[PDB]
Each structure stands twice: as C-alpha cells, then as structure tokens.
C-alpha cells in the first residue's frame, strides 16, 4: 500500500548509479580503455585481483551462485519483512546492500584438472579438482588467466571443501559441481542438511549484516 509509487525503480537507480560499485566499474572500464589507448607481494597482487574480480562479478553473468545473488536475496527478504521504508530508504539502502553485503569473498579459475582460488583478503590456494590436495601456486599464470577465463564465485570455498570432502566422502560429480558452484548440488546438500554447508551458508548470511 502506497499512493506515491512514483517509479521507485527509477528512484533507486538514481542513487544506485553513484554508489562506489558503480563508479568502481566505470573506473575499471575507463582504465582498460586508457590501457588500450596507451602506446607480501603475492598477497597484495591477489588482493588487487580480488577487488577487480568482485567488480567483474557485479558486471557479468555467472552460472554459479554468485555472492551478489545471496546479497540480493537477503536484501529482498529484509526489505519485504521490514515495515519501515520511506521514499529515501530503498534508495541509499539498495546501494548499501550492493556495497557492504559480504565484504569478503573468494573466486576460482578452473583449469585442466586443477583449480586456482583467490581471496579479497589476500589468501590464495591451488588444488587438484578430483582429489583436493593443494599444489604450488602460479600468480603470473593466474593473472594471465583471470582476464579471459570465466570466474567461479567460491560460495563454498576450499577451506570448506577440504573439511567436507575429508569427513563426508563426496563423489566426483558432486564435488565437481560444488566447485563449479552448481545450485543443483548446493541445494541438494542443504536438503541433506549437513552441518558444514549449513554453517557456511549461515556464516555468509551473517556476513550480510551491514
């Protein structure tokens, strides 16, 4: 119930275009265009790459669970249940739900039976895809591959895969699909109601606190 309803979509978009995420993707695009029109070190480099990958996740259409997806779902639930939403609330809260929801996240690049995972904090791993045992990392290869290959939002990160595979023995298909962040197998595991996945999903929902 509301009489105004004067394009709340447009009102939200107006303040959304100016959020840090919007100007950040604009600056990323501008920087790439300028590069075209021109002519712990590992932890720092991976942190920068992680920020860029967060921007890429916002920009593009990923087939994984895509942390931004969970952020939007939590935002929708909170908005629907909350009963205090003025004219200038959905604007300037959809922006915040874009900014601060899940500040820390990780991404994956799958490659020829191996996986290279990165974190915005600075963490970085690389591990075989059939049996989860980490292998030596190659930051130069990762920086090469991140620009072209598709990135898998590590909803279920390697810290959790190791525990889950080691304790709850998983099949190759389910493990591969969890690595690919397949919603089918993620919802299958939550339907099974196993504590590791339940705990991690609750951790992310808590991280959406703002």
Kindly list the residues in this chain that would bind a copy of itself in the complex (CB under 8 A).
144, 147-150, 183-185, 187-188, 191
Question: What x-and-dash track marks residues 72-101 binding another protein by CB under 8 A?
Answer: ------------x-----------------
- Using DSSP's 3-state secondary structure scheme, residue 125 falls into strand
The answer to whether 141 touches 134, Cβ cutoff 8 Å, is: no
Question: What x-and-dash track marks residues 24-53 binding another protein by CB under 8 A?
Answer: ------------------------------
The answer to whether 153 touches 105, Cβ cutoff 8 Å, is: yes
Q: How far is the CB of 118 from a copy of itself (least distance, A)?
A: 18
Q: How many angstroms separate the CA atoms of 86 and 29, rounded? A: 34
Residue of 19, 24, 165, 188 that binds another protein (CB under 8 A): 165
Q: How far is the CB of 36 from another protein (least distance, A)?
A: 47
Q: How far is the CB of 3 from another protein (least distance, A)?
A: 7
Q: How far is the CB of 147 from another protein (least distance, A)?
A: 14
Rg over alpha carbons for the chain, rounded to the nearest Å, is 19
Q: How many angstroms separate the CA atoms of 40 and 2, rounded? A: 54
- The beta strands (E) that lie in the chain are given as 106-111, 114-119, 124-128, 152-153
- Chain positions contacting another protein, by CB under 8 A: 3, 84, 131, 140, 165-171, 194
């Amino acid at each position: 119930t509301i009489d105004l309803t004067k394009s709340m979509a447009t009102s939200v978009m107006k303040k959304f275009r100016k959020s840090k995420l919007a100007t950040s993707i604009s600056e990323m695009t501008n920087s790439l265009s300028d590069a075209a029109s021109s002519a712990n070190d590992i932890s720092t480099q991976t942190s920068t790459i992680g920020k860029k990958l967060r921007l890429k996740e916002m920009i593009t259409q990923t087939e994984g669970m895509s942390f931004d997806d969970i952020s939007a779902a939590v935002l929708k639930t909170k908005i629907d249940m909350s009963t205090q939403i003025g004219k200038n609330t959905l604007p300037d809260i959809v922006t915040e739900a874009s900014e601060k929801f899940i500040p820390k996240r990780s991404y994956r690049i799958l490659k020829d039976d191996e996986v290279m995972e990165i974190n915005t904090e600075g963490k970085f791993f690389a591990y075989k895809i059939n049996t989860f045992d980490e292998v030596p990392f190659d930051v130069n290869k990762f920086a090469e591959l991140v620009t072209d290959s598709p990135v898998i939002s590590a909803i279920i990160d390697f810290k959790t895969l190791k525990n889950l595979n080691d304790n709850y023995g998983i099949t190759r298909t389910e493990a591969l699909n969890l690595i690919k962040s397949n919603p089918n197998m993620l919802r299958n595991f939550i339907n099974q109601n196993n504590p590791i996945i339940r705990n991690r999903i609750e951790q992310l929902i808590l991280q959406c606190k703002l």
